[PDB]
Amino acid sequence: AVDTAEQVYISSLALLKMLKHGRAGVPMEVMGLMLGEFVDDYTVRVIDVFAMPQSGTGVSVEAVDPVFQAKMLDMLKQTGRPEMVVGWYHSHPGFGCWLSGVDINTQQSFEALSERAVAVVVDPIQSVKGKVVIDAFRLINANMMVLGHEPRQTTSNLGHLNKPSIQALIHGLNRHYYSITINYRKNELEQKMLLNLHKKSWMEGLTLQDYSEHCKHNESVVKEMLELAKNYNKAVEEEDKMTPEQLAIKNVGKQDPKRHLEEHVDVLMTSNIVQCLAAMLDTVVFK
Amino acid sequence: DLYSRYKKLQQELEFLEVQEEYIKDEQKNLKK
Amino acid sequence: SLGLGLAAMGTARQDVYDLLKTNLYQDDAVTGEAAGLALGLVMLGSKNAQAIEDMVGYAQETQHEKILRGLAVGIALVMYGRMEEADALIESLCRDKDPILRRSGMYTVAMAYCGSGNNKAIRRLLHVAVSDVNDDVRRAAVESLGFILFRTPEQCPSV
Amino acid sequence: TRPANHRQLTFEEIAKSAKITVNEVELLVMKALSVGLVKGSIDEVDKRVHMTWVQPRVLDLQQIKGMKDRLEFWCTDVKSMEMLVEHQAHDILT
Amino acid sequence: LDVFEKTILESNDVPGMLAYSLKLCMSLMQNKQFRNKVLRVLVKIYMNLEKPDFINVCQCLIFLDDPQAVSDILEKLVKEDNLLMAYQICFDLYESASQQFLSSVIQNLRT
Amino acid sequence: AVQKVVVHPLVLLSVVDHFNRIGKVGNQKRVVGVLLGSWQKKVLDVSNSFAVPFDEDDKDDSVWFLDHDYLENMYGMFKKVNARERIVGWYHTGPKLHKNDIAINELMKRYCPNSVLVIIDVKPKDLGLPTEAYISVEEVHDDGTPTSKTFEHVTSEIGAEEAEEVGVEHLLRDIKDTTVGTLSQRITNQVHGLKGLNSKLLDIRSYLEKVATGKLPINHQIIYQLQDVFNLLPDVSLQEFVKAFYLKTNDQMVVVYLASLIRSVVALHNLINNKIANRDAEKKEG
């Protein structure tokens, strides 16, 4: 049996292949393989990911010829080092994460050879910048659903941590499959070299900024900042009046001075203090 | 017992100086 | 092994350390709590720095997690009530990239200051409770406060 | 030969250094600006010329020593003015 | 050290003034460097007292970690030959002190 | 010919994992692979890659191998599984610009006309951008050889994409310098780029190691720029460069003097907004 503390380790490398292939053909359900490395009865490690040419419909998506599959795995053994197929994924476009009535069927084909084929859903729409909603699954027997017997024999305080969505609960969870808690394998091998490689620049700051127009832009804000302060020479004057909780609901048609009047003060500061300081270092450094 | 008054109010600055630091660094970290 | 190190707790017996070496180097997941928990129990408050070097040199290259977890409690327990004699290790594990070993560094300062009302602990034991990103280490950080401040139960409900 | 401080020679100096009269050096330097070997400006009443750019030439293992020492104290000037910034704006970002 | 030893050997009554000073020198003590210098002289004077107190000379000792000094006064009580007063020097030692300290002092009890 | 290159963080990462997979050789191996991408609008794009089997022996290091069948079929799979995708050139792991990369580019230019290379970093320490790319130009020219060909660096940056920006910003979850205010410029290029100019002043100090002792080729085409730098060293402080500098300080600070004057009044209006909620509740509530 299982302990519902399965703890699927994935990677740092596979998920970018997951989302790029998932989003380049997003409204169709694209899918692929999961090529990883098995460990003990509890955990599993999926390290590499590749897709195949597919043929789809609106509600269904299929594969094509199996000669693509064996020839791809031969070339990945000879280059790098050999692995084994730990599972498979697919991509609900903007749905969420569940096993539909056809998604459950090819899972049933894959769980026969190895019983631990991990079924993975990636949604490349719901993922904005943070949560990437993924939620890997695996089947449970509908024979034990007939028995009324509750499976998986909880022996660790690790499973019931993330709560399922109600929309995935409308679907087959939890009558034919279960969820798995996952995290990410992170290391200085990779974590240091995506941070210190992505957002970097070279001259954007040792340079000046359109020197006749920066001082011109120092009037393009201040000119309407007069009349915006005239509204601030207006709105305080109608206080000691109708209970300023009313002055929250009422003022939603037009812009207030008070919040907008500290908005430009930050802008009229950092545009000046940066441009003044960066000019006064080139006097020292350059002769 | 003023030497007992000194330890407890040395234990005050022992205990108060960390607290004013403790909410001070929350101020940036909650924003982050 | 869990029953064996329990009766031989804090005893520095070489005989229990012999079969706990070969229990440790199995490269196996399921021996993880078997090895590293009892490896600290028999060396409680011993700070035998070669055995620390054996432990922290072992939980950097293994690829299972219970062996990263059982040593995380075991290396905290080899030092006990030291007040200055752990602090280079405390800076070492807190600077490391490993979230478990940063979390393991939180239990070690929790045992190097049992009941001790020192400020030098409470500066950066509780600074990293603010800033660190893993939820595992953040739960270990705030649960180190009663173990260093049970000597006075009056101040702990105030903080 | 002249430093970057002035490099502002007069027409009388060309009348010394090229032994040619005053009424032909302006015809000379307008040719030099036209070919593109020098880039500067010409005054006529104060009898001086503000040369700015000259054609790059070659040099032996002695003029690199001039570019050795003039480059070397420019290292510490980049060091010195930055050392304020990591000290004065240190708490602004750790 | 010796003007503090002169506080307890002066024109001063002792109802309990040599008791809470032991409490102050353990609870609010800064370091171990000034603790052991104070604590070691406060119980030799208890041996110098006409009634040697037994629980505090054991309480201080495990704070001080002397695995031979409790066996020196255990010899004095074997010399005195009464297990009534050789009792709270011993079960307070068993209850408080660590397993290694009781495994280190046992060479000095059987010798 | 080519404006610039655009690199995704996937292909940035898709070399590192292969550098791990051949890291068990220990002794010496450079990762060399096929770079895929689609250059459009005179802007070089880089999308996908893999790595080809490649070995090197030190004695007579002119013997390379590219298993082109592995290049034929796997690209044919990749042309199948993405017909938008095509070859864009190649790359190598590039610590220090190895010698075979003068004819590796000429070995496989029968696929890509502008077969561009990319030098990446596996041990990151710099203050710049640790992705470098060159281009192939050839010359029957000035002094060196009748057959001369030298690589020239076209500028390099890491392009983003709306799909992968979701991924990388989830994969960081680390120490960050967001909230760009008055301080991000102070540390991205005022703390940092001034020390960025260090390793470029010190870089030409490293070529300067040949004054009478270093390597035997001397200058000819290296000093025309170095003669220019001390020539194009900026204007001295005697002219109205003194006077017009005080002029704009006397203009830029006036805007700061107005803007700081506003900052005091706004928080004072906020102060009464707390004295309206302090006194008008102690009698009401208690």
JSON list of C-alpha atoms in Angstrom, two decimals, chain C residues 31-158:
[
{"chain": "C", "resi": 31, "resn": "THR", "atom": "CA", "xyz": [17.94, 3.94, 7.13]},
{"chain": "C", "resi": 32, "resn": "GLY", "atom": "CA", "xyz": [17.78, 7.74, 7.37]},
{"chain": "C", "resi": 33, "resn": "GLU", "atom": "CA", "xyz": [16.03, 8.03, 10.71]},
{"chain": "C", "resi": 34, "resn": "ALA", "atom": "CA", "xyz": [17.70, 4.77, 11.79]},
{"chain": "C", "resi": 35, "resn": "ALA", "atom": "CA", "xyz": [21.22, 6.15, 11.42]},
{"chain": "C", "resi": 36, "resn": "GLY", "atom": "CA", "xyz": [21.26, 9.89, 12.06]},
{"chain": "C", "resi": 37, "resn": "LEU", "atom": "CA", "xyz": [18.94, 10.06, 15.05]},
{"chain": "C", "resi": 38, "resn": "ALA", "atom": "CA", "xyz": [20.77, 7.50, 17.18]},
{"chain": "C", "resi": 39, "resn": "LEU", "atom": "CA", "xyz": [24.10, 8.86, 15.92]},
{"chain": "C", "resi": 40, "resn": "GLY", "atom": "CA", "xyz": [23.45, 12.02, 17.91]},
{"chain": "C", "resi": 41, "resn": "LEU", "atom": "CA", "xyz": [21.89, 10.38, 20.98]},
{"chain": "C", "resi": 42, "resn": "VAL", "atom": "CA", "xyz": [25.00, 8.44, 22.01]},
{"chain": "C", "resi": 43, "resn": "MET", "atom": "CA", "xyz": [27.16, 11.55, 21.54]},
{"chain": "C", "resi": 44, "resn": "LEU", "atom": "CA", "xyz": [24.87, 13.93, 23.45]},
{"chain": "C", "resi": 45, "resn": "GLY", "atom": "CA", "xyz": [26.85, 16.97, 24.55]},
{"chain": "C", "resi": 46, "resn": "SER", "atom": "CA", "xyz": [30.09, 15.40, 23.34]},
{"chain": "C", "resi": 47, "resn": "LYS", "atom": "CA", "xyz": [30.93, 17.87, 20.49]},
{"chain": "C", "resi": 48, "resn": "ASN", "atom": "CA", "xyz": [33.41, 15.34, 19.04]},
{"chain": "C", "resi": 49, "resn": "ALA", "atom": "CA", "xyz": [34.23, 17.56, 16.07]},
{"chain": "C", "resi": 50, "resn": "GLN", "atom": "CA", "xyz": [35.45, 14.73, 13.82]},
{"chain": "C", "resi": 51, "resn": "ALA", "atom": "CA", "xyz": [32.04, 13.08, 14.22]},
{"chain": "C", "resi": 52, "resn": "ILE", "atom": "CA", "xyz": [30.39, 16.44, 13.41]},
{"chain": "C", "resi": 53, "resn": "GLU", "atom": "CA", "xyz": [32.66, 16.57, 10.35]},
{"chain": "C", "resi": 54, "resn": "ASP", "atom": "CA", "xyz": [31.56, 13.02, 9.54]},
{"chain": "C", "resi": 55, "resn": "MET", "atom": "CA", "xyz": [27.89, 13.99, 9.86]},
{"chain": "C", "resi": 56, "resn": "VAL", "atom": "CA", "xyz": [27.81, 17.38, 8.13]},
{"chain": "C", "resi": 57, "resn": "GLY", "atom": "CA", "xyz": [30.14, 15.98, 5.47]},
{"chain": "C", "resi": 58, "resn": "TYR", "atom": "CA", "xyz": [27.63, 13.19, 4.83]},
{"chain": "C", "resi": 59, "resn": "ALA", "atom": "CA", "xyz": [24.39, 15.20, 4.57]},
{"chain": "C", "resi": 60, "resn": "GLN", "atom": "CA", "xyz": [25.49, 17.28, 1.59]},
{"chain": "C", "resi": 61, "resn": "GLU", "atom": "CA", "xyz": [25.77, 14.66, -1.15]},
{"chain": "C", "resi": 62, "resn": "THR", "atom": "CA", "xyz": [23.10, 12.06, -0.42]},
{"chain": "C", "resi": 63, "resn": "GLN", "atom": "CA", "xyz": [19.95, 12.11, -2.54]},
{"chain": "C", "resi": 64, "resn": "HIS", "atom": "CA", "xyz": [17.27, 10.92, -0.10]},
{"chain": "C", "resi": 65, "resn": "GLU", "atom": "CA", "xyz": [15.47, 13.06, 2.45]},
{"chain": "C", "resi": 66, "resn": "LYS", "atom": "CA", "xyz": [15.07, 11.01, 5.64]},
{"chain": "C", "resi": 67, "resn": "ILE", "atom": "CA", "xyz": [18.87, 10.76, 5.67]},
{"chain": "C", "resi": 68, "resn": "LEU", "atom": "CA", "xyz": [18.86, 14.54, 5.30]},
{"chain": "C", "resi": 69, "resn": "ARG", "atom": "CA", "xyz": [16.24, 14.71, 8.06]},
{"chain": "C", "resi": 70, "resn": "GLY", "atom": "CA", "xyz": [17.57, 12.30, 10.69]},
{"chain": "C", "resi": 71, "resn": "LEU", "atom": "CA", "xyz": [20.98, 13.95, 10.65]},
{"chain": "C", "resi": 72, "resn": "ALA", "atom": "CA", "xyz": [19.26, 17.34, 10.91]},
{"chain": "C", "resi": 73, "resn": "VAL", "atom": "CA", "xyz": [18.17, 16.44, 14.44]},
{"chain": "C", "resi": 74, "resn": "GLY", "atom": "CA", "xyz": [21.32, 14.42, 15.13]},
{"chain": "C", "resi": 75, "resn": "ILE", "atom": "CA", "xyz": [23.85, 17.19, 14.55]},
{"chain": "C", "resi": 76, "resn": "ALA", "atom": "CA", "xyz": [21.78, 19.50, 16.76]},
{"chain": "C", "resi": 77, "resn": "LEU", "atom": "CA", "xyz": [22.03, 17.06, 19.66]},
{"chain": "C", "resi": 78, "resn": "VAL", "atom": "CA", "xyz": [25.79, 16.39, 19.66]},
{"chain": "C", "resi": 79, "resn": "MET", "atom": "CA", "xyz": [26.26, 19.84, 21.26]},
{"chain": "C", "resi": 80, "resn": "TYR", "atom": "CA", "xyz": [24.36, 20.70, 24.44]},
{"chain": "C", "resi": 81, "resn": "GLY", "atom": "CA", "xyz": [24.58, 23.88, 26.52]},
{"chain": "C", "resi": 82, "resn": "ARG", "atom": "CA", "xyz": [27.67, 25.46, 25.01]},
{"chain": "C", "resi": 83, "resn": "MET", "atom": "CA", "xyz": [26.95, 29.25, 25.06]},
{"chain": "C", "resi": 84, "resn": "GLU", "atom": "CA", "xyz": [29.80, 30.09, 22.64]},
{"chain": "C", "resi": 85, "resn": "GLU", "atom": "CA", "xyz": [31.03, 26.73, 21.40]},
{"chain": "C", "resi": 86, "resn": "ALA", "atom": "CA", "xyz": [28.54, 26.20, 18.57]},
{"chain": "C", "resi": 87, "resn": "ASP", "atom": "CA", "xyz": [28.46, 29.65, 16.99]},
{"chain": "C", "resi": 88, "resn": "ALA", "atom": "CA", "xyz": [30.82, 29.04, 14.06]},
{"chain": "C", "resi": 89, "resn": "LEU", "atom": "CA", "xyz": [28.63, 26.08, 13.10]},
{"chain": "C", "resi": 90, "resn": "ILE", "atom": "CA", "xyz": [25.50, 28.19, 13.64]},
{"chain": "C", "resi": 91, "resn": "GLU", "atom": "CA", "xyz": [26.82, 30.75, 11.16]},
{"chain": "C", "resi": 92, "resn": "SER", "atom": "CA", "xyz": [27.84, 27.91, 8.83]},
{"chain": "C", "resi": 93, "resn": "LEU", "atom": "CA", "xyz": [24.47, 26.20, 8.50]},
{"chain": "C", "resi": 94, "resn": "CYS", "atom": "CA", "xyz": [22.46, 29.44, 8.39]},
{"chain": "C", "resi": 95, "resn": "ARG", "atom": "CA", "xyz": [24.57, 30.68, 5.48]},
{"chain": "C", "resi": 96, "resn": "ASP", "atom": "CA", "xyz": [24.19, 27.38, 3.59]},
{"chain": "C", "resi": 97, "resn": "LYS", "atom": "CA", "xyz": [21.72, 26.98, 0.73]},
{"chain": "C", "resi": 98, "resn": "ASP", "atom": "CA", "xyz": [20.14, 23.84, 2.21]},
{"chain": "C", "resi": 99, "resn": "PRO", "atom": "CA", "xyz": [16.71, 24.59, 3.72]},
{"chain": "C", "resi": 100, "resn": "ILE", "atom": "CA", "xyz": [16.87, 21.51, 5.94]},
{"chain": "C", "resi": 101, "resn": "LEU", "atom": "CA", "xyz": [20.35, 22.40, 7.17]},
{"chain": "C", "resi": 102, "resn": "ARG", "atom": "CA", "xyz": [19.34, 26.00, 7.79]},
{"chain": "C", "resi": 103, "resn": "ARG", "atom": "CA", "xyz": [16.45, 24.43, 9.71]},
{"chain": "C", "resi": 104, "resn": "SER", "atom": "CA", "xyz": [18.98, 22.11, 11.34]},
{"chain": "C", "resi": 105, "resn": "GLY", "atom": "CA", "xyz": [21.02, 25.16, 12.33]},
{"chain": "C", "resi": 106, "resn": "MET", "atom": "CA", "xyz": [17.95, 26.44, 14.15]},
{"chain": "C", "resi": 107, "resn": "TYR", "atom": "CA", "xyz": [17.72, 23.41, 16.41]},
{"chain": "C", "resi": 108, "resn": "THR", "atom": "CA", "xyz": [21.43, 23.53, 17.22]},
{"chain": "C", "resi": 109, "resn": "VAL", "atom": "CA", "xyz": [21.35, 27.06, 18.63]},
{"chain": "C", "resi": 110, "resn": "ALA", "atom": "CA", "xyz": [18.17, 25.91, 20.39]},
{"chain": "C", "resi": 111, "resn": "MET", "atom": "CA", "xyz": [20.23, 23.25, 22.17]},
{"chain": "C", "resi": 112, "resn": "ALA", "atom": "CA", "xyz": [23.38, 25.33, 22.67]},
{"chain": "C", "resi": 113, "resn": "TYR", "atom": "CA", "xyz": [21.32, 27.75, 24.79]},
{"chain": "C", "resi": 114, "resn": "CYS", "atom": "CA", "xyz": [18.94, 25.51, 26.78]},
{"chain": "C", "resi": 115, "resn": "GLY", "atom": "CA", "xyz": [17.22, 27.91, 29.17]},
{"chain": "C", "resi": 116, "resn": "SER", "atom": "CA", "xyz": [19.81, 30.59, 28.42]},
{"chain": "C", "resi": 117, "resn": "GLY", "atom": "CA", "xyz": [18.45, 34.13, 28.25]},
{"chain": "C", "resi": 118, "resn": "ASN", "atom": "CA", "xyz": [21.18, 35.41, 25.95]},
{"chain": "C", "resi": 119, "resn": "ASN", "atom": "CA", "xyz": [20.63, 38.30, 23.55]},
{"chain": "C", "resi": 120, "resn": "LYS", "atom": "CA", "xyz": [23.32, 36.99, 21.19]},
{"chain": "C", "resi": 121, "resn": "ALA", "atom": "CA", "xyz": [21.06, 34.07, 20.33]},
{"chain": "C", "resi": 122, "resn": "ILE", "atom": "CA", "xyz": [17.88, 36.13, 20.11]},
{"chain": "C", "resi": 123, "resn": "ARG", "atom": "CA", "xyz": [19.28, 38.63, 17.60]},
{"chain": "C", "resi": 124, "resn": "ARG", "atom": "CA", "xyz": [19.68, 36.25, 14.69]},
{"chain": "C", "resi": 125, "resn": "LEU", "atom": "CA", "xyz": [17.69, 33.19, 15.79]},
{"chain": "C", "resi": 126, "resn": "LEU", "atom": "CA", "xyz": [14.68, 35.48, 15.49]},
{"chain": "C", "resi": 127, "resn": "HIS", "atom": "CA", "xyz": [15.99, 37.61, 12.63]},
{"chain": "C", "resi": 128, "resn": "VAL", "atom": "CA", "xyz": [15.90, 34.56, 10.35]},
{"chain": "C", "resi": 129, "resn": "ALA", "atom": "CA", "xyz": [12.38, 33.86, 11.61]},
{"chain": "C", "resi": 130, "resn": "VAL", "atom": "CA", "xyz": [11.40, 37.04, 9.75]},
{"chain": "C", "resi": 131, "resn": "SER", "atom": "CA", "xyz": [13.31, 36.71, 6.52]},
{"chain": "C", "resi": 132, "resn": "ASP", "atom": "CA", "xyz": [13.77, 33.08, 5.49]},
{"chain": "C", "resi": 133, "resn": "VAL", "atom": "CA", "xyz": [11.58, 31.76, 2.70]},
{"chain": "C", "resi": 134, "resn": "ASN", "atom": "CA", "xyz": [10.98, 28.09, 3.56]},
{"chain": "C", "resi": 135, "resn": "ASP", "atom": "CA", "xyz": [8.06, 27.32, 5.83]},
{"chain": "C", "resi": 136, "resn": "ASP", "atom": "CA", "xyz": [9.90, 24.39, 7.40]},
{"chain": "C", "resi": 137, "resn": "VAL", "atom": "CA", "xyz": [12.68, 26.53, 8.88]},
{"chain": "C", "resi": 138, "resn": "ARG", "atom": "CA", "xyz": [10.22, 29.25, 9.98]},
{"chain": "C", "resi": 139, "resn": "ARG", "atom": "CA", "xyz": [8.39, 26.73, 12.16]},
{"chain": "C", "resi": 140, "resn": "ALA", "atom": "CA", "xyz": [11.67, 25.57, 13.68]},
{"chain": "C", "resi": 141, "resn": "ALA", "atom": "CA", "xyz": [12.72, 29.16, 14.40]},
{"chain": "C", "resi": 142, "resn": "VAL", "atom": "CA", "xyz": [9.78, 30.21, 16.57]},
{"chain": "C", "resi": 143, "resn": "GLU", "atom": "CA", "xyz": [9.65, 26.84, 18.34]},
{"chain": "C", "resi": 144, "resn": "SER", "atom": "CA", "xyz": [13.20, 27.46, 19.56]},
{"chain": "C", "resi": 145, "resn": "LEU", "atom": "CA", "xyz": [12.06, 30.25, 21.88]},
{"chain": "C", "resi": 146, "resn": "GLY", "atom": "CA", "xyz": [10.62, 28.22, 24.74]},
{"chain": "C", "resi": 147, "resn": "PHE", "atom": "CA", "xyz": [13.66, 25.93, 24.74]},
{"chain": "C", "resi": 148, "resn": "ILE", "atom": "CA", "xyz": [15.92, 28.93, 25.34]},
{"chain": "C", "resi": 149, "resn": "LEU", "atom": "CA", "xyz": [13.48, 30.83, 27.58]},
{"chain": "C", "resi": 150, "resn": "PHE", "atom": "CA", "xyz": [11.63, 28.32, 29.74]},
{"chain": "C", "resi": 151, "resn": "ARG", "atom": "CA", "xyz": [13.74, 29.66, 32.62]},
{"chain": "C", "resi": 152, "resn": "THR", "atom": "CA", "xyz": [11.28, 32.57, 32.78]},
{"chain": "C", "resi": 153, "resn": "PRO", "atom": "CA", "xyz": [7.73, 31.78, 31.59]},
{"chain": "C", "resi": 154, "resn": "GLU", "atom": "CA", "xyz": [6.70, 35.43, 32.09]},
{"chain": "C", "resi": 155, "resn": "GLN", "atom": "CA", "xyz": [8.30, 37.01, 29.02]},
{"chain": "C", "resi": 156, "resn": "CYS", "atom": "CA", "xyz": [7.41, 34.41, 26.38]},
{"chain": "C", "resi": 157, "resn": "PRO", "atom": "CA", "xyz": [3.65, 35.26, 26.19]},
{"chain": "C", "resi": 158, "resn": "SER", "atom": "CA", "xyz": [4.67, 38.91, 25.71]}
]
